[PDB]
Amino acid sequence: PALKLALEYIVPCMNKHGICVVDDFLGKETGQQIGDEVRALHDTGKITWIEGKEPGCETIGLLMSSMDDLIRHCNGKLGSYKINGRTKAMVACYPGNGTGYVRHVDNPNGDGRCVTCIYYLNKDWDAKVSGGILRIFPEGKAQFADIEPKFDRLLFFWSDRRNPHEVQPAYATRYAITVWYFDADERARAKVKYLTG
Ligand SMILES: CC(C)(C)OC(=O)N1CCN(c2ccc3c(O)c(C(=O)NCc4ccc(C#N)nc4)ncc3n2)CC1
Numbered sequence: 001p002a003l004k005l006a007l008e009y010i011v012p013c014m015n016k017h018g019i020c021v022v023d024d025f026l027g028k029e030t031g032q033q034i035g036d037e038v039r040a041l042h043d044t045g046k047i048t049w050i051e052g053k054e055p056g057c058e059t060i061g062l063l064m065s066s067m068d069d070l071i072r073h074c075n076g077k078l079g080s081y082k083i084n085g086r087t088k089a090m091v092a093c094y095p096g097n098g099t100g101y102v103r104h105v106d107n108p109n110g111d112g113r114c115v116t117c118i119y120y121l122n123k124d125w126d127a128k129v130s131g132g133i134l135r136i137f138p139e140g141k142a143q144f145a146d147i148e149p150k151f152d153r154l155l156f157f158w159s160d161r162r163n164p165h166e167v168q169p170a171y172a173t174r175y176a177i178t179v180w181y182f183d184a185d186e187r188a189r190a191k192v193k194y195l196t197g
């Protein structure tokens with residue numbers, strides 16, 4: 001029921017808060033398969049872009065298609081964005097070496113990315129021992145939000161200056177897939193801007 005989810009939760013949740021969490025996105029079996037697909041690429045070789053239709057990246061493609069389907073079902077009711085495209089999936093490994101990520105904005109200079117979309121692959125993850133908590137600071141709010149990189153969790157937020165985020169140090173290696181959805185007008189203007197100067 002993606003139509004229920006998008007329209008009843010994601011959209012109003014995003015328009016009010018700029019951040020939306022969807023736990024238990026694909027289920028245990030589906031998630032661990034995506035987890036296993038990532039672990040395979042890490043070890044063998046076969047921060048890298050995955051198109052979605054490679055050998056050993058099928059369930060990654062399902063995730064992406066699922067991700068996409070939810071975006072479709074929002075019916076262009078996320079802000080006033082015309083999402084007509086996205087990046088490839090960034091499959092990254094995040095070491096457990098007690099280093100955290102400095103507070104940043106994902107899209108600071110209007111390159112076209114309007115929505116950050118992140119899926120976490122950390123089974124039985126316990127931030128109380130392992131760390132790696134995401135702190136987001138909604139630009140014009142009295143509160144900030146700590147968010148665990150929990151298994152089978154899907155996280156949406158505005159990529160722009162509204163959501164600066166840092167990640168606390170972790171003491172165990174982490175896996176997450178990230179996708180950025182483009183606004184049509186914004187992405188168009190950035191392309192011409194680059195070429196025109
Ligand atoms: C094609 C076009 C020019 C549009 O985009 C690019 O070329 N990009 C997009 C921007 N970009 C990156 C790369 C990396 C980025 C990045 O780790 C973050 C970010 O908040 N990371 C922290 C983090 C996230 C998950 C987990 C887990 N579990 N632990 C820590 N946030 C933002 C990040 N942005 C570099 C590649």
Ligand SMILES: [Mn+2]
Nearest residue numbers: 104105106165
């Ligand atoms: Mn970021």
